[PDB]
Target: Saxiphilin
Amino acid sequence: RHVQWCTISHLEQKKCNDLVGSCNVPDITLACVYRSSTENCMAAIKDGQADAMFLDSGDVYKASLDHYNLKPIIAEPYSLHRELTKCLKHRQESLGGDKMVKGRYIPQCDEKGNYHPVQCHASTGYCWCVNANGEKIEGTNTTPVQTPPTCPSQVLTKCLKERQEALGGKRIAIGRYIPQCDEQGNYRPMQCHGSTGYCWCVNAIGEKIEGTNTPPGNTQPTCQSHDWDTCHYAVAVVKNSSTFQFGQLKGKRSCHSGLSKTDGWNAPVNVFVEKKLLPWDGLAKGSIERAVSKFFSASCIPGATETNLCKQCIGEEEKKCKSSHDEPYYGDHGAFRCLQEDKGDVAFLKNTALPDEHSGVYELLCPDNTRKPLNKYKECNLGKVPADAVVTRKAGDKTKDINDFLLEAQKKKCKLFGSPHGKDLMFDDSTTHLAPLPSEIDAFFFLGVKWYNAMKALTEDVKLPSKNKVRWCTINKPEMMKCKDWAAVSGGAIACTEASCPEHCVKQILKGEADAVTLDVQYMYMALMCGLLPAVEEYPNKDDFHPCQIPGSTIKDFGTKRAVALVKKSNKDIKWNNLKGKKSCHTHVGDIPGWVIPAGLISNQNDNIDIESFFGESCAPGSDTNSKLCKLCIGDPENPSTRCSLSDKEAYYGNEGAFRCLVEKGDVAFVPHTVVFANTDGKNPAEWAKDLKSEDFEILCLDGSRAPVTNYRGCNLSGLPPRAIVTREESVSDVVRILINQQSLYGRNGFEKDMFQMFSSAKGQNLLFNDETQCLIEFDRQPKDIMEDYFGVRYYTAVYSASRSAVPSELIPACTFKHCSNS
Ligand SMILES: NC1=N[C@H]2[C@H](CO)N=C(N)N3CCC(O)(O)[C@]23N1
Model:
């Protein structure tokens, strides 16, 4: 296994070469490939000449475009603010679940708010070991007949971990820095070197605050406590011997980290434009680089083409003004050197490149036309900037080898983040740890929509789609065709986009390529986790059309299905809490009322034991024919095996089929509440349902009681939420207004229903909306968690344990990735 790293300079190649010799990672060999600039390395990775490089966030955006097709895979984790510990959040969510779902696991947290390594389930007496995230160590379950297990102690905090490393077996590491930790195990704001007498400030995760390093005998700056804001900040640094303010930058000499860098270009230019220091607003006034060329008299901006923007660079011959360390003024520490050597009056870089020392001739140039000390960058900056990242090809053929090497190299403490040859070679010198990013992350989700759009805005005039048009996302060709017919009559209110599946529609809406889509319940958790909201919902009640005639009216019964546990009146011995070992009948594996809801409740109350193992002998079409979930399944009256199959071949398949399994050979069936009324009172002419009576059956309540099949509203496993039309938060009002108007024309009572019908089509079934939809009802947003608000507390608890930590789609870790954005 090999990893070929692309270096952009002679100095970087020299550092990478040193790591080839010094860093011994078994199974994986590192190699270094020289190219002359950042862009030439990006092309080399696209072409397979190399596999990976570290990129500024600005270049991460540029590399994501079709010219290069690279994606970020590894980056240093950062924090926006202090958050609740995971255990305490889990405790709060589980305590906020539906109290009628009895016997649920409530985590046990310690005096620091973390998980006790031993976790136990009160109602079952089962205990197990967990990791720091409270996730069960599989295979450590112990039954109540045994003593609770012996579980390893929790992993130490970063400060205590590095304290024990610094000591390293010895009881005192003499002459070396030993971190000082508080009582929660986080870094004390003030840190001091036990031998040199120097002191400085750190944030809560131990990152040094620039401009606070203080030699002994001097007054140290005040160190802020509980600092969990670890995003990097773009800053403008100047010497205290000058006197101009930010608003007087016109005509000055400037040093920038680079033309493509976010801290050296995007952040200052963004502020120049918003403060109208630059006579520029759109691509009609030329390029941004030309406008900046008119603003400054002479600058060093590596990568620039304009002559005066390269005048101050000091690279030799072809190396001058190159995006490469061979240009001595390239990068954050090159821009600072350019100011230090008086080739510029101001340098544009980020806080992590500022001097550590408090005393000196440098200060910060704030955009509010004041100047402030180095350590006040959080209140004197040009914005938070995104993290930087290791990138590779979008195909990800080398992602695992790159991740494995860097993980092993960091474990062995290889010299990744420093070098005698120079600063910020291969990686930023400020970097302390590099971690894998979510597997589905791309530049959009890594940078965030705010910074992604801001970067795009400097390259093209982004025509923002109209708020009076709803771009509908379709998932197949017939839907696209019905949507094109809708657009033809809509007068421009409706347009169409094409995706392959509902999740890609969610992605399109997030990225501003579409505006709305109708989602099955099984996709709503991922949609809500990613930040979309229900705008309107499909109202399915055929008995009451009054909420559809008069909008906004009160709804007596939304009419969605209710999952129930159906048993016979004769079997008086069976209640909810003894279904273990009985004979269950499921419509099919994957059905929400017949499987997902029952399996969720069984898992919540029996330590995630398999619904396979929970019952005795069952019929659940979808399982393996050899399992006990198909023993009850009768294949086909016309024997071919078609047993336990997902077709009408299996006699026990579906709503009516699970009702068959109950009466024939079974004692409990998981079905919607409508199944018993549809197949009793002689409503089914078949011989098995020969005038079977509805009063012959009852439904099981979660409190151990029973009730007649008519009271499904108060004795159910869970009611399903309706299907929802989702959109972005800022677009809910427009989508609601446009859809309600379209419904007044082409709904079931539309004034123009002869021209188009929203809820039917000759092109197929359930296109765009379900064909049985009565109308769309605006979602009445309540002051609660959107998860509980949309799903209902019962469904939320039964299927998701009322938790925001489920991952039913790998898109969720990518779309919930936190960003370094500004207001
Ligand atoms: N806000 C809000 N309105 C309701 C309508 C259905 O009636 N839509 C939903 N999905 N819900 C689920 C729970 C609920 O309370 O019934 C509701 N929440």
In short: The domain at 470-556+721-815 is CATH 3.40.190.10 (D-Maltodextrin-Binding Protein; domain 2). The pocket of YGF is lined by residues 537, 555, 558, 721-722, 779-780, 782, 789-790, 792 (CB under 6 Å).
